[PDB]
Amino acid sequence: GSMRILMVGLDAAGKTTILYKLKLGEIVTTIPTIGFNVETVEYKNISFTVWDVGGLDKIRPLWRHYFQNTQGLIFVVDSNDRERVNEAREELMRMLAEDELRDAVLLVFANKQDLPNAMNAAEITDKLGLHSLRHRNWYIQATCATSGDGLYEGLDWLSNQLRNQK
Ligand SMILES: Nc1nc2c(ncn2[C@@H]2O[C@H](COP(=O)(O)OP(=O)(O)OP(=O)(O)O)[C@@H](O)[C@H]2O)c(=O)[nH]1
């Protein structure tokens, strides 16, 4: 068995970029993902099956098909997209309301930190209302997917949540 991780977030957030940076160590050219991409990533001797599911609004209903048995959620946010940060919050809270996910741990990637007007992790925390969450293991990590910055730190937390020993 591997650890089942669902990676979701609005379209353009950087999910597919993150998946292939994590898996392949390269920055891949993408198009908006119509279905899903999937790879198993090994980190510190723990294997994570990461489901990168398309975030275009039209296909957001399909996220629910991936909730079952999910152990960890990676919610990717475009930290430069102030106009849509409340929409990101709404989608996150709609997902967190699901009983199926009540035990899932939540890693938020505050992505695109390379952009000069990016909101930082503290700001994104406020905008997503993370501090109000109850009975939820959660962590927010500032990242730049293209440079790799912050990714392994996110994985450190996620691996620690899901593993029970060295
Ligand atoms: N500046 C900047 N751009 C990024 C970063 N991460 C991803 N991108 C760019 O953002 C755009 C969208 O990235 P994707 O990975 O396709 O986004 P997605 O979340 O998979 O989008 P959907 O497939 O629609 O769900 C691409 O042009 C990426 O190169 C980042 O850290 N900084």
Ligand SMILES: [Mg+2]
């Ligand atoms: Mg994609």
